[PDB]
Amino acid sequence: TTFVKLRTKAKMPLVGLGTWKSPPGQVKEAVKAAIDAGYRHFDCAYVYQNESEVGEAIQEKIKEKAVRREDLFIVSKLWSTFFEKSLMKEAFQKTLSDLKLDYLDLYLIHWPQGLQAGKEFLPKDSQGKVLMSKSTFLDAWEGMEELVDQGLVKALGVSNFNHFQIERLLNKPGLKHKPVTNQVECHPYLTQEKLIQYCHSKGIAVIAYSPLGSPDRPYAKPEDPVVLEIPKIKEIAAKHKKTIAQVLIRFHVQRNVAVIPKSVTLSHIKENIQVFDFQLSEEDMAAILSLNRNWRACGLFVTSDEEDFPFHEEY
Ligand SMILES: NC(=O)c1ccc[n+]([C@@H]2O[C@H](COP(=O)([O-])OP(=O)(O)OC[C@H]3O[C@@H](n4cnc5c(N)ncnc54)[C@H](OP(=O)(O)O)[C@@H]3O)[C@@H](O)[C@H]2O)c1
Numbered sequence: 001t002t003f004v005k006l007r008t009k010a011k012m013p014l015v016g017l018g019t020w021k022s023p024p025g026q027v028k029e030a031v032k033a034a035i036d037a038g039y040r041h042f043d044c045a046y047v048y049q050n051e052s053e054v055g056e057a058i059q060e061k062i063k064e065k066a067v068r069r070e071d072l073f074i075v076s077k078l079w080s081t082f083f084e085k086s087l088m089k090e091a092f093q094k095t096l097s098d099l100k101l102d103y104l105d106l107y108l109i110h111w112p113q114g115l116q117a118g119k120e121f122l123p124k125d126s127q128g129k130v131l132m133s134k135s136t137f138l139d140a141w142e143g144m145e146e147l148v149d150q151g152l153v154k155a156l157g158v159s160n161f162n163h164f165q166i167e168r169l170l171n172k173p174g175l176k177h178k179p180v181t182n183q184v185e186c187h188p189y190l191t192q193e194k195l196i197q198y199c200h201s202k203g204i205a206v207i208a209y210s211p212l213g214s215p216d217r218p219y220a221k222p223e224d225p226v227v228l229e230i231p232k233i234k235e236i237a238a239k240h241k242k243t244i245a246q247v248l249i250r251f252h253v254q255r256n257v258a259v260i261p262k263s264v265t266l267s268h269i270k271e272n273i274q275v276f277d278f279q280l281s282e283e284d285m286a287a288i289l290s291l292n293r294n295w296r297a298c299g300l301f302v303t304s305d306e307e308d309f310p311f312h313e314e315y
Contacts, residue, residue, distance in 0.1 A: 002276055004256050006180045007203040008155055010105065012073055014253045015273050016041030018209060018262030021216050024053050026264040031057030035067055037270045043183075043209070043260040044099065045077040045110060046091055047121050051098035059100045074101060075183075075207075077110040077159060078144065081117050083135030085143035092147060107144060107153045108183060111160055111300060112137045113308035122300075130302050137165070137308070138172055145176045157181035157207075160299060162310040163198045170202065183207040185214075185298045186257065187227045187248060188291035194315035196257060207258040211248050214297050216262075225295050232287050240278045243271060250275045251288050 003011040017034040019027060019042070027050045031042060035057070044054045058074070061067050076099065082091040096104065114133035116123040123131040137158070147153040157179045158166065169179060182199050186192050186208035199206045213227025214220075228244060237247045245261070245268070252259040253275055263269045280288070299311055 004205050004258060006155060006205055007178060008180060010073075010154060010180075012106075012181070012205060012207075012258055013039075013041035014256070014258050015039065015249065015275060016043050016073070016075070016207075016258060016260040017269070018260040019044045019050060019054060020048055020209075020262055022048075022050060022262060022264045024050050027053040028057045030264040030269060032061060033266050033269050034273075035061045037273050039269075039273055040067070040071055041073040041075070041258065041260070043075045043207070045079070046082075046095050047077075047079045047110065051076065051095055055099035055101070069101070073105040074099065075106040075108065076104055077108040078140060079121060080111045080113055080115040081121060081123065081133070083114040083133055083137070083140040083143075084117060085139070087117055088140060088143040092152070096152065103151060104153045106155050106157055106181065107147065108157045108159045108181070109137050109140055109144075109161070112158070112165055112310055113300070113303055113306055114140070130300075130306075132303070132306050137161075138169065141169060141172065141175075148177045155180040157183065157204075159183040160185075160310055162313045163195060163315050164313060165308075165310060166198070166202065166204065179204055181205045181207050181258075183209060183260075185210045185296055186252065186259075187211050187213055188230055188233070188251065188288050189213075189225050189227060189293050189295040191289055191292040192315070193289070193292070196255065198315065200256075205256075205258065207260060208252045209260050209262075210298055211252055211259050211261050212245055217297055220297075224297065225293065230291065232291065236280065236284050236287070239284075240280075242274075242278060245272060246275055247280070250278065250280055251285070254280055254285065
C-alpha cells in the first residue's frame with residue numbers, strides 16, 4: 001500500500017523526500033528528520049551538489065540503528081554532460097562516493113538531451129547558446145547497464161522522457177536492462193494521464209516531482225498557475241481534515257505513482273508523509289483530474305529546438 005512494486009519486484013516507497021534546491025547542511029538535517037518521520041525513499045542528483053550532505057545523514061541514521069540500508073530506496077541521476085561512458089563512470093563513482101553507499105537502488109537519466117562535456121552543467125558558447133553533446137541517452141544507457149551487471153545499481157530509469165523516447169529505449173538493439181521508472185513533473189495542472197497509462201502498461205513506474213508546483217523555483221512569474229492555491233484542493237482538504245499539500249501528495253499515491261515532495265522545513269517534512277490515513281473519493285479524484293491544462297514549470301526550455309527535446313509531443 002505504501003509502495004509500488006517495480007518490474008524487478010523491488011518495492012519503491014510511494015512517498016519520498018525530494019532534494020533539489022535544498023541548501024547544504026539544511027539537507028542533512030532534512031534527511032535526518034525525514035528518516036525519523038518514516039521516509040525511506042530519497043531523491044538526490046549530481047547536479048544538486050548536495051549528495052555529500054544526504055550521504056552524511058543516511059550514514060548517521062544507519063550507524064544509530066534507526067534504519068537498515070536494505071529498507072532505504074536511494075535514487076540519484078546521471079547529468080547530461082556525462083553521457084560518454086568514461087565520464088559517466090567518473091560521475092557515478094563521485095555520486096556513490098558522496099552518498100557513502102555501496103549501491104544505488106535506482107539510477108536515472110536526468111534529462112534526455114546530452115550536453116557538451118566540461119566543468120559547466122549548462123555549457124554555453126560566447127553568444128550564450130547552450131552546447132549539446134554527440135552522445136545520446138541510448139549511449140548513456142549502454143554505459144549505465146554495466147553498473148547493474150556490476151551490482152552498483154539495482155535498477156535503471158529515466159526522467160523527463162516522453163513515450164516515443166521510452167519506446168526507442170525499449171527497442172534499442174541489444175538492450176539489457178529495461179527502464180523501471182520515469183520521473184516526471186506531475187500535479188493537477190499537469191496530471192500526465194496518457195504518460196502514466198503508457199508507463200504502467202510497459203512495466204514502468206512513475207515518480208512525480210513538483211507535486212506542490214515547485215514554488216521555490218527561481219523563475220516563477222505572477223502569471224503562472226499556482227498549484228498550492230487551487231480552489232477545489234482547499235475544499236477536498238477541509239473535507240478530509242488534511243492540508244492542501246497533503247491532498248496534492250495523496251493525489252499521486254492513490255494513483256500508485258510515487259511522489260517526492262521537497263522540503264527542508266521540519267513541519268512540512270512530517271506533514272508530507274501523513275498521507276496513508278485517508279482516501280480521496282472517486283468524485284474528488286475526477287475533480288482533481290479535470291484540472292489538467294498541460295502546464296509545466298520544470299525542464300531545460302532553452303534547448304527546445306535541439307534534437308532530443310521531449311516536451312514537443314503530446315505525451
Ligand atoms: N528534472 C527532474 O528530474 C527533477 C526536476 C525537479 C525536481 N526533481 C526532484 O523532485 C523534487 C520535488 O520538486 P520541487 O523541489 O521542484 O518542488 P515541490 O516539491 O513541489 O515543492 C517544494 C516547495 O514546497 C515547499 N513545501 C514543501 N512541503 C510543503 C508543505 N507541506 N506546505 C507548504 N509548502 C511546502 C518547500 O519549502 P520547504 O522546503 O520550506 O518546505 C519548497 O519550497 C525535487 O526536490 C527533486 O528531488 C526532479
